[PDB]
């Protein structure tokens, strides 16, 4: 109830500038690379082995994993500059924009712009432009040059809308068997975006394109975290509406997916991050 | 300074039995594969990106990373059976046998035997034989079963010796610049095995063969942990003998290799694990 995560569009110029600079310090120090690797490591831990489920996606842990993931990243931000909190990209308001590329999140003092088509959609503006920000491939080796390409795939031409979010918030159960991509009437899976997908969380990823478009490499782009803060916010809201609803599966799901299972690559459990206000933060909607 | 790690040679038949049982329960529960995946992930975290050093291997954190790795694994053992500690494979003693492959470590009540050359060196004896124990590959998906092929390469025809260990215990610097495979007069690099490699710790990997011969997939074989318990024992002896001498680099090394850097995949630092007794355990040779 003390660290405030604000809407990106409500940040001051000094807030935008300070957040971007802590991120760059985290990159220069080698700490930011830890999160790219954690995320790529979580994607090849199948629960159980041979399953399409993994520790961080395509199953019930999707939401608590990224909550814990954002929680650590913001802790690393705060250790450099204690004023800094993780902002959230309310992409569902930007979807009403006649041209969402022109939103202030993409301004040159924050995330920088869309990909440049003549340079193969290499990002050449803002603080994470090529030559200012070096990316990493799946196998931990340099791959030179952030890329984006907004709305360029047929399956995700538009950002998810407010009605998408309101509809997801209606779903009555956190998750349902078989706790994977096929789960029906499941808030986790609906928000993750596999209900007639890509929608919501999956749809944003494909919309940004670039590394943001392939899940193992998506945290190469700083907007990933701003994206997932919003996903964490929607979850926070859902938990306050369906108060008498808790995590599922409680047990008898694959190991790593149950309420008290450690979430690879950590020992942190879903129960550990159920209450975000006890984790030290709130969203600027109270 | 209380949990005692025993030489595999001095283990009772019931200690061999309970330890195997515990490893199999960790496997069944999903816990063992976290260790496998942790080791692969460490191998992809290069320090820095593009370097041939990684978080767990080929740089200075080699030694503390595995100490933490084994300490975690041992705690997971304790949680299933509080009497079980991690034993160590004193491979320098095995190398003295005319034929090290007859060592009791490889018996059918413990680790099981060599691979079957008719079955592409799949292990078909012991509690980790194919069809009782499932390996996973670098992508977290089942592979065919444990493999071993003892001493089959030209570079590692034999296990490291007593003199190889004593010769390493002589070196006074923990590590040297450039904190990597090329470090000279480096305890870390000598013990890891890159001085006229493969020696010592790398030699053991390459002599076992199978999954043990491929550092990323090595923990699919539970003897990996008995191996590293021995490496950790040797470093611990080095610390008792060179008490003035500390970890290096203190600072100015690549991030993830300095004394107070987190060791990916964890936040544990080398400082956190320097004193093995303050982690709760000792090796039997300390107790006489
Ligand atoms: Cu996979
Ligand atoms: Cu993710
Ligand atoms: Cu995501
Ligand atoms: Cu690599
Ligand atoms: Cu290793
Ligand atoms: Cu090893």
Structural class of chain A: mainly alpha
What count of structural domains of chain A?
Answer: 1
The two chains with the largest interface, and their residue counts, are: A-B, 29 and 30 residues
Helicity level of chain A:
25-40%
CATH topology description of chain A: di-copper center containing domain from catechol oxidase
Ligands and ions found: copper (II) ion
Distance from N terminus to C terminus of chain A (CA atoms, Å) equals 9 Å
Tell me the major beta sheet of chain A: 2 strands, parallel
Which assembly state applies to the chains in this document?
homodimer
CATH architecture of chain A: Orthogonal Bundle
Secondary structure tally, helices of chain A:
8
SS elements, strand count of chain A: 2
Keywords (chain A): Copper, Metal-binding, Zinc
Protein name (chain A): Tyrosinase
InterPro entries (chain A): Di-copper_centre_dom_sf (IPR008922), Tyrosinase/Hemocyanin (IPR050316), Tyrosinase_Cu-bd (IPR002227)
Family (chain A): Belongs to the tyrosinase family.
Description of the molecule:
The first copy, chain A, has helices at residues 13-28, 32-42, 62-80, 91-94, 162-170, 187-192, 200-208, 223-241, and strands spanning 3-5, 281-283. Chain A is mainly α and 286 residues long. In chain A, strands 1-2 form a two-stranded parallel sheet. Chain A is globular, with a radius of gyration of 18 Å. The A-B interface holds A 29-31, 33-34, 37-38, 40-41, 44-50, 54, 134, 136, 139-142, 254-256, 262, 264-265 and B 29-31, 33-34, 37-38, 40-41, 44-50, 54, 134, 136, 138-142, 254-256, 262, 264-265. Bound molecules: copper (II) ion (6 copies). One copper (II) ion is lined by residues 139-141 of chain A. The PDB classes it as metal binding protein.
């Amino acid at each position: 109830k003390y660290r405030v995560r604000k809407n990106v569009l409500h940040l001051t110029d000094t807030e935008k500038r300070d957040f971007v600079r802590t991120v760059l310090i985290l990159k220069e120090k080698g700490i930011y690379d830890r999160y790219i690797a954690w995320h790529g490591a979580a994607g090849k831990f199948h629960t159980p082995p041979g399953s399409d489920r993994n520790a961080a996606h395509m199953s019930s842990a999707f939401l608590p994993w990224h909550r814990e993931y954002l929680l650590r990243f913001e802790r690393d931000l705060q250790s450099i500059n204690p004023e800094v909190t993780l902002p959230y990209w309310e992409w569902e308001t930007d979807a009403q924009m006649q041209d969402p590329s022109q939103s202030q999140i993409w301004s040159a003092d924050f995330m920088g712009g869309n990909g440049n088509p003549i340079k193969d959609f290499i990002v050449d503006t803002g603080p994470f432009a090529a030559g200012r920000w070096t990316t990493i491939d799946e196998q931990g080796n340099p791959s030179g040059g952030l890329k984006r390409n907004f709305g360029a795939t047929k399956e995700a031409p538009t950002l998810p809308t407010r009605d998408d979010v309101l509809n997801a918030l209606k779903i009555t159960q956190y998750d349902t068997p078989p706790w994977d991509m096929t789960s029906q009437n499941s808030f986790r899976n609906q928000l993750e975006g596999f209900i007639n997908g890509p929608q919501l969380h999956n749809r944003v990823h494909r919309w940004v394109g670039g590394q943001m478009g392939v899940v193992p490499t998506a945290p190469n782009d700083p907007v990933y975290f701003l994206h997932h803060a919003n996903v964490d916010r929607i979850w926070a809201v859902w938990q306050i509406i369906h108060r008498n609803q808790n995590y599922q599966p409680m047990k008898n799901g694959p190991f790593g997916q149950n309420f008290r299972d450690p979430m690879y690559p950590w020992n942190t459990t879903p129960e550990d991050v159920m209450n975000h206000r006890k984790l030290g933060y709130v969203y600027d909607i109270e």
